[PDB]
Amino acid sequence: EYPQFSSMAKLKAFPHSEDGQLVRLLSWHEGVGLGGGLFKVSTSSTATGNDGTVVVASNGVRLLRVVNGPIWADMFGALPNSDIDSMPAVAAAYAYAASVNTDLYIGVATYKFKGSTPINVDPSRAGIIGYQGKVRIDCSEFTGSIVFSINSSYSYTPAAYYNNLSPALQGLYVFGAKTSGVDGLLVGRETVGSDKSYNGQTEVRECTFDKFDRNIRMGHNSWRFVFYKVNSLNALSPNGILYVPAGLDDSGEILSFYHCQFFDGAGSNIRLSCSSYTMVFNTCSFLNITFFVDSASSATVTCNGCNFANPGSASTRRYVDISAGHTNVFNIIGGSIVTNSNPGQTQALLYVSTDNLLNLVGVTAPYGGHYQQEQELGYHAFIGGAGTVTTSGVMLQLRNGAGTCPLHSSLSTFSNWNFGYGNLNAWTVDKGTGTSSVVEYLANAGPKGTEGAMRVAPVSVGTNVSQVQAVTNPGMFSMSCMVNIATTPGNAGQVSIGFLDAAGNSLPGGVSANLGTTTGWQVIGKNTLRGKVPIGAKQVRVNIQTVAGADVKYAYLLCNVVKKL
Amino acid sequence: EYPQFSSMAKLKAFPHSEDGQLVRLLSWHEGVGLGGGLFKVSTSSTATGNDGTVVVASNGVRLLRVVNGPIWADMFGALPNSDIDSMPAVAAAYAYAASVNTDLYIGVATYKFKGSTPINVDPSRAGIIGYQGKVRIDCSEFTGSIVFSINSSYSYTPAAYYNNLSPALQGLYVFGAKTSGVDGLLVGRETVGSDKSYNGQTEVRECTFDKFDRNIRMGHNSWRFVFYKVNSLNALSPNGILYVPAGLDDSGEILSFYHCQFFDGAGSNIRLSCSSYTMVFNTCSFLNITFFVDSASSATVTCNGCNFANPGSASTRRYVDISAGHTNVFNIIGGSIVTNSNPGQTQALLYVSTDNLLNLVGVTAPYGGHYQQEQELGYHAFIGGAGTVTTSGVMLQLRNGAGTCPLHSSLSTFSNWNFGYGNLNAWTVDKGTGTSSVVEYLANAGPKGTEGAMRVAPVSVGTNVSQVQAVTNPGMFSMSCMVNIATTPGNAGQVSIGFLDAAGNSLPGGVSANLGTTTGWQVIGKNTLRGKVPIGAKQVRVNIQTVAGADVKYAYLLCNVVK
Amino acid sequence: EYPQFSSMAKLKAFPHSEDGQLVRLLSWHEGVGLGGGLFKVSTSSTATGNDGTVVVASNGVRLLRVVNGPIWADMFGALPNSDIDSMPAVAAAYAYAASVNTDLYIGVATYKFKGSTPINVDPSRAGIIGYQGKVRIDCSEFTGSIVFSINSSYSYTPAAYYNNLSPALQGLYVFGAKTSGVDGLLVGRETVGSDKSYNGQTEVRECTFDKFDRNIRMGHNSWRFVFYKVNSLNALSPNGILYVPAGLDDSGEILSFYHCQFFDGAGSNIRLSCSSYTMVFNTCSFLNITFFVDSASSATVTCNGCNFANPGSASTRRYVDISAGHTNVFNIIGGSIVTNSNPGQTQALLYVSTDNLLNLVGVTAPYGGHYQQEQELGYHAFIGGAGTVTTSGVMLQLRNGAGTCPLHSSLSTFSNWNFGYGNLNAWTVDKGTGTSSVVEYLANAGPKGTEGAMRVAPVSVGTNVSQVQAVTNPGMFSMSCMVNIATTPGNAGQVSIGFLDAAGNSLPGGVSANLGTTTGWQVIGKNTLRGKVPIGAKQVRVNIQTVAGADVKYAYLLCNVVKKL
Ligand SMILES: CC(=O)OC[C@H]1O[C@@H](O[C@H]2[C@H](O)[C@@H](O)[C@@H](O[C@@H]3[C@@H](O)[C@H](O)O[C@H](CO)[C@H]3O)O[C@@H]2CO)[C@@H](O)[C@@H](O[C@H]2O[C@H](C(=O)O)[C@@H](O)[C@H](O)[C@H]2O)[C@@H]1O[C@@H]1O[C@H](CO)[C@@H](O)[C@H](O[C@H]2O[C@H](CO)[C@@H](O[C@@H]3O[C@H](CO)[C@@H](O)[C@H](O[C@H]4O[C@H](C(=O)O)[C@@H](O)[C@H](O)[C@H]4O)[C@@H]3O)[C@H](O)[C@H]2O)[C@H]1O
Ligand SMILES: CC(=O)OC[C@H]1O[C@@H](O[C@H]2[C@H](O)[C@@H](O)[C@@H](O[C@@H]3[C@@H](O)[C@H](O)O[C@H](CO)[C@H]3O)O[C@@H]2CO)[C@@H](O)[C@@H](O[C@H]2O[C@H](C(=O)O)[C@@H](O)[C@H](O)[C@H]2O)[C@@H]1O[C@@H]1O[C@H](CO)[C@@H](O)[C@H](O[C@H]2O[C@H](CO)[C@@H](O[C@@H]3O[C@H](CO)[C@@H](O)[C@H](O[C@H]4O[C@H](C(=O)O)[C@@H](O)[C@H](O)[C@H]4O)[C@@H]3O)[C@H](O)[C@H]2O)[C@H]1O
Ligand SMILES: O=C(O)[C@H]1O[C@H](O[C@@H]2[C@H](O)[C@H](O[C@H]3[C@H](O)[C@@H](O)[C@@H](O[C@@H]4[C@@H](O)[C@H](O)O[C@H](CO)[C@H]4O)O[C@@H]3CO)O[C@H](CO)[C@H]2O)[C@H](O)[C@@H](O)[C@@H]1O
Ligand SMILES: O=C(O)[C@H]1O[C@H](O[C@@H]2[C@H](O)[C@H](O[C@H]3[C@H](O)[C@@H](O)[C@@H](O[C@@H]4[C@@H](O)[C@H](O)O[C@H](CO)[C@H]4O)O[C@@H]3CO)O[C@H](CO)[C@H]2O)[C@H](O)[C@@H](O)[C@@H]1O
Ligand SMILES: O=C(O)[C@H]1O[C@H](O[C@@H]2[C@H](O)[C@H](O[C@H]3[C@H](O)[C@@H](O)[C@@H](O[C@@H]4[C@@H](O)[C@H](O)O[C@H](CO)[C@H]4O)O[C@@H]3CO)O[C@H](CO)[C@H]2O)[C@H](O)[C@@H](O)[C@@H]1O
């Protein structure tokens, strides 16, 4: 039987003398019953004392803890469900665990982290694991720059062998008080080191970061981190849900997020600003936040099976805003985009700026009666910006009673759709026998007063303006037009879309929209100019018919036939 | 030294009196050696006894277990490999574990769950973890409606912070005896609550559900659950592998399945019936089951890198059947579709109904000599239904010795391919010096007797029916025709496919099929009317020519150029 | 209180006699403090002793270890941080663990595996888990054929119930000394069994395999294994990073890799040679290695959100080489392709052979000034081989100052682009008034001397050779030409690309490249013949202008407009 000691204090005070003897510590703190274990006496060891796994008695004799498996924080005097600052004990336990390439467990309970000293996790040596349940790390009184950083101390080995073997952080709810200047998690390094830090294959999993300034911020050497079941919400910074600043060194390779939830920012968002940066999000959700991309160049974001939505929010914030730079690519593959009603969606929820690319694959474009994107764009479409959009396997909501809209200018079926030619070329104008009829291009005459429009004022007989383009099945389509009836003696006309085969035979599937009699700029086509491309179609023809005696302006004649583009 | 007690019974019987004293329980059950630990005496505590972590001695004094890490079921008297019902002890241990936001471990062994009382896991509080190995939960004698449900007790906090921190279920083989009315796992809530249940980020991993009525069924509040390495097999219900019923409240956001296996249903299948429901399957396999989607609208299922196959099965069941509703989308991206031989595949293995969409990306369409889809469709193609099919990066098996077939009517190269115009518009008819030979549209004369056909009976000189459409390289093509020869002297004629340049000159790569001399409706083109689109092609031409003395009906001239 | 014994030896030596008595083993090895636990005396057990969980005392009485949870290797006398061969104790502990369907833990430490006896993990019964941290399994002195194999003992059940419930291997750095004939991990069976082995749902996670002959090799029954955070590097075999040999039985269903890193092979690579084999790589990276696919038929590899790159390498090795077979499909969806500078990239980094297919989706094609692919291909393009390439949502680096290049021959905008017709068909020749100007096809006259070229030698007035093809928005393009000026009186001419709508109206977005005056074969178009397709474009026209008095050969006029119409 091994001699027994009821507390770490009693273990240290006893004049141990039997080299090699095993002794039992019953508890670190007297009367608690946690943090005990077996220790081997070594009278000759000169190992450094740490009051946890290497204990120096008052006579200098060492007691060396026998550990099997992970180090536990209570071995260093940490206590569960305590008001005392636990960060010193966790930091000391972590320093030791890292020194022997062993993970650190924190027993499930609540903890408070106070002070201002970050814990720097070295993923090549040891992770910190809340074990096991809903481990709560209250950092509301912490005043340092970052609570945790994760960054390797090695430039190559053994990081290339070890980072992947265990997570760097697991099982922790880490939260602040939205104090300015206190970030939650730094992924990588604050400043550029003299050598690189080999961080690839480091995992953060089953953690929540909440109520920091930036909850999660990428630093230098942020490459091939993976995140599983990570939640980030309710940060202070406009960029606080997840921030990738510009100018990072040795960063950007396949930052990966599996089933992560980025949400309820209450003004905080995701912003990717670093060039040459590649991120992959699988089955993630982006809720009540915007995903900004303003990298100078070469950002590639791939969202596979993700959701973008606004649950319970009246905000007109965008979902994805690729706003600057060139050669930036954003993929939405599968998943969903959900647009619950709000007082009026007055800007595009997706935006892709010049020289950038937004790709939609296998996803349904939503529609809602509250859509009012023309307030921003001048016309009724889902996506803004002068970049490029592609579609593959995209579904339109062709049976939505409120309507459907085209997705983007870059998918325009018809040439000179916005009268950007500065004339009516590409359009066939047929005034018929109306010699007094007038059809004219007008500059600064569209909805904004800054764009071209086509004015049609027929006399005696109606005027038809039309255009034909090649089309093929399979496909689905939606068109919107901006129309301003100045005067009309009745229904002012109709916009129609029809299909022909190669032989010129008219096919089923034609649709039309009456213009009515209401004056002023209005959207025509929402629940009328839409449908499926009929099998056998080889041409699509748009016709704008204006009746005799009417005076109507047309702008932004935007049809999209969605197919693989 | 801490005083020691050899059993929970002895711990409770002792007249504890020293407030604050630590004592050691050696074992819950006498002589077993499981479930012991340190306890702290509290003479003043009024905590409720649970015979596990809060023990009330016979004199009223409390003993409070010191726990570090998860709660274990043996702390409440559960025993491994016992014939006694373990569900009460696990349920009591779980109630406590959940009350202190701590997961519950069940030591690896076999357990019997009897009775009829489900365990309701609250993923915002605590999961149940089989630790660690092949933990066997025998529910063959359980008679309740569900074994496990998983549903948060919170509408927002702390669920928004906690659901993701640990799994709800891990490491368990949970099985029944296929008793009607006994389901395995309920994902969410049976009925609509007064407020919502915040379930997002809840995980089920490394579990098998087997031999229930419905193995896995979604309830209300089924949103952002994730499943990893979950197996579901051999259920009783036609919908028993995975069932998402219609009409769920607060459900449908990104239900996610990673490397899950849905298989060997022996009559049970997957069915998604809820509208506005979005599911993602990554490297899953669907084996010897059908994936049905009949949501009224707005289902989106994305299968990335999955396999659909029929290993060891003679069944002609479909693989994917999007059978009703509108605005339903099913994506197959990468992965594989495997069609082992059976006595005859008499219906299409993929089906997409009107107003729905089936997208194929980066996957190879298989072919097998046992394919007989015409028995359903009237004609030889891989996919059924009046919906829309798209392809991107799809490969055809052009060098499959048994043949190749077109994929879908919605990809038809040619106009009026099925004589659905009600006339021969879009088709060029040339008998040359056409006098006494017969070429006629016949209604209700095709393979099923309900569709149009074209009859040709030459006496004079042969007839050519032709059509040209634009095409571009690169591409792969396959055509099937339905042909009915009544009589002919020798070879009855040929169907040919040729390619032209922009100016109309013929290119290499043309193919043809002899009609032969067998009578009755037959498929022409399987291993003949297929190939790669030749370099320089800008037009594709189909030509049907019939010889003197033959009398032949033609129907369903279906070419697909994929790429 | 339970009687206590200080070592396994002392436990065995004692004359136990009281059936049912619980006794405490303090340590397996005297004085260490590891491997102890409670044992129950059993006078009725006739179980075979294993010196771990079933102990036979010197009088024959059995002592049955009370275990809760996994078996631990130290229960069988394994020791941490020891230079004794630990493989026998681990193997004995594993044999027992599998026999009771319980996983085996190895306490985190370093271990040496010597000898030549593999451990055959049965995933239907038990995994081996390094617990928990950077567990180091030194196999440098092991001389057997494989260190670990993973293969089920069952043909159906309970493998169909059990394989998925726990990993087969977790948390281990397993390494050799690059000895020929010693592989690290065999996935499945070495030879075909008479019955199948049901391996689906078996996981290997958080392991590194390093410095073996083949680090990871697929055997028979290799189906529905999943790998998470697995590293494979620095193998000896040319195929040693990951090898899937031809001829495997019962194999190929959805072999799945999540966030795995395949890298730094120093001559070792990935090779997929088995037919009817389907692999999925999600957020993996392939670094300083080639991914070879030479399956006879029906390989399907899907890479979602992966990176292919050459960090720190001067090697001109390919990234992906689909080199043989037919009906092989390789998908690159999202992620990145990175081509750091080297002395000159003289072959294509992607190659797809005849009858195979390489699909690019939502990824940016890189460009670098060191690109010299024409040394292999004859012309300046990114991808080699006579197979097919498709694009969907692909971005070109249109603003890269060094240039941009077309991707592949199969995406050629223009017909007879390589003069492979053996004539000048599809090209429109306009000599103007200069009738004696020479425009001719020349065989074996291109850059390699084995391909056709077009010689243009105008007299008096310049000659224009042109071609028009259909195009549509959305799109972007890059063209390269091989040009050989023999003689010229000045700037030899220019190549230009312009866009028209369906009605023949000219659009913005035209580009041109001067030929200059330097003689000899050169690439024209790198930073000139590129751009975005204008909205409303329905035709693209290339024109090659050669001035009077110039004598120029043209070859390989390769434009790619992505997506190709
Ligand atoms: C305004 C609007 O956009 O309406 C859409 C619905 O239109 C309906 O047609 C009517 C028109 O709106 C009316 O204006 C009028 O129009 C008539 C014209 O049609 C006619 O031509 O001319 C008439 C004049 O003479 C004119 O009056 O009447 C029509 C007919 O009534 C329907 O089309 C309806 O479809 C539904 O019903 C039809 C049918 O019975 O005919 C069925 O076929 C459909 O299956 C059925 O859906 C339209 O509803 C949308 O339908 C889409 C498919 O076409 C579907 O994709 C879409 O659902 C998506 O969007 C909703 C809202 O964003 C999502 O719902 C959310 O889901 C979340 C979970 O993911 C959940 O958390 C959300 O709850 C939160 O938010 C809600 C909320 O209000 O949004 C709150 O209530 C909660 O408190 C909060 O927690 C929410 O449920 C869904 O997931 C997504 O798929 C349908 O909206
Ligand atoms: C030669 C080369 O390819 O240059 C490309 C850059 O061209 C620049 O233009 C200049 C030309 O090169 C010059 O030739 C000349 O050209 C003139 C013409 O412009 C004019 O019209 O005609 C003249 C004829 O008379 C002609 O002389 O001058 C021009 C102008 O200066 C720029 O275009 C440059 O872009 C950058 O600057 C522009 C700008 O300010 O105008 C910005 O708009 C861009 O945003 C900015 O990038 C070109 O650089 C590339 O730009 C691409 C976008 O267009 C971008 O995608 C690409 O980056 C990719 O490739 C690099 C290299 O592979 C990747 O970088 C690596 O990233 C790794 C992590 O993923 C990292 O680990 C690597 O580091 C390791 O390896 C490196 C190494 O490179 O070997 C080692 O050094 C490290 O130690 C090691 O750790 C590496 O950083 C990047 O990730 C990927 O996205 C840009 O290279
Ligand atoms: O094939 C060769 O020529 C040589 O290949 C190996 O050489 C090793 C290789 O250069 C290794 O590169 C490291 C980087 O140093 C490290 O920064 C990290 O690089 C990533 C990069 O993959 C990605 O694109 O961008 C991220 C930043 O976003 C960047 O961090 O990992 C790679 C791969 O491990 O460095 C070691 C040490 O210098 C080299 O040894 C073979 O080992 C050589 O033998 C071989 O000659
Ligand atoms: O930006 C704003 O306007 C406000 O944003 C936050 O508000 C919180 C947000 O409304 C939160 O919504 C919860 C839902 O209550 C919950 O049902 C769940 O919603 C999912 C939904 O994402 C998906 O589309 O469909 C599933 C069902 O399939 C549905 O369950 O999650 C979301 C996100 O957490 O509710 C809380 C509590 O009411 C709101 O506070 C900010 O918190 C506000 O400050 C901000 O003003
Ligand atoms: O629906 C039916 O007709 C019958 O379905 C079940 O029958 C079971 C099924 O045939 C099961 O197949 C096993 C294979 O034996 C096994 O090799 C493995 O197959 C995979 C295959 O999915 C994939 O394509 O290729 C890999 C190799 O790369 C291959 O290993 O798994 C499947 C699915 O579990 O075998 C059992 C035992 O013979 C059958 O019982 C029902 O159980 C029957 O009741 C039903 O009649």
Numbering used by the authors:
A (entry chain A), C (entry chain C): 15 to 579
B (entry chain B): 15 to 577
Paper text:
Here, we describe a phage tailspike protein, named K2-2, that specifically depolymerizes the K2 capsular polysaccharide (CPS) of K. pneumoniae into tetrasaccharide repeating units. During the initial stage of infection, the tailspike proteins (TSPs) of bacteriophage recognize specific polysaccharides on the surface of the host cell and attach to them for adsorption. TSPs, also known as polysaccharide depolymerases, have the function of binding and digesting CPS. TSPs typically consist of three domains: an N-terminal particle-binding domain that connects to the tail structure or baseplate of the phage, a receptor-binding domain that extends from the homotrimeric structure and is responsible for host recognition and catalytic activity, and a C-terminal domain that plays a vital role in trimer formation, receptor binding, and intra-molecular chaperone functions.
The sugar-bound crystals were subsequently obtained by soaking the E323A crystals in the crystallization solution added with the hydrolyzed K2 CPS products for 18–24 h. The complex structure was solved at 1.58 Å resolution. Interestingly, the sugar binding changed the space group of the crystals from P21 to C2, resulting in a single trimer of the enzyme in the asymmetric unit. The product-bound structure revealed three equivalent intersubunit carbohydrate-binding grooves in a trimer; two were bound with a dodecasaccharide, while the third had only one tetrasaccharide. Surprisingly, adjacent to the residues Ala323 (mutated from Glu323) and Glu267* that served as a boundary, the bound dodecasaccharide was, indeed, divided into a tetrasaccharide and an octasaccharide, which corresponded to the one and two tetrasaccharide repeating units identified in the hydrolyzed products of K2 CPS. This finding strongly supports Glu267 and Glu323 to be the catalytic residues, which allows for the numbering of the polysaccharide chain from −3 to +6 based on the direction from the non-reducing end to the reducing end. Furthermore, as judged by the clear electron density, we observed an O-acetylation at the C6-OH of +4 Manp. The bound dodecasaccharide lies in an elongated intersubunit groove, with the orientation of its two-repeating-unit chain nearly parallel to the longitudinal axis of the β-helix and the single-repeating-unit perpendicular to the longitudinal axis, reminiscent of the intersubunit carbohydrate-binding site reported for Sf6 TSP and ФAB6 TSP. Notably, the C6-carboxyl group at the branched glucuronic acid that connects to −3 Manp formed a salt bridge with the residue Arg331 and a hydrogen bond to Ser327, suggesting a crucial role of this carboxyl group in the K2 CPS recognition by the enzyme. The distance between Glu323WT and Glu267* is ~4.9 Å, in good agreement with the typical distance between the catalytic nucleophile and general acid/base in a retaining glycosidase, i.e., 4.5–5.5 Å (35).
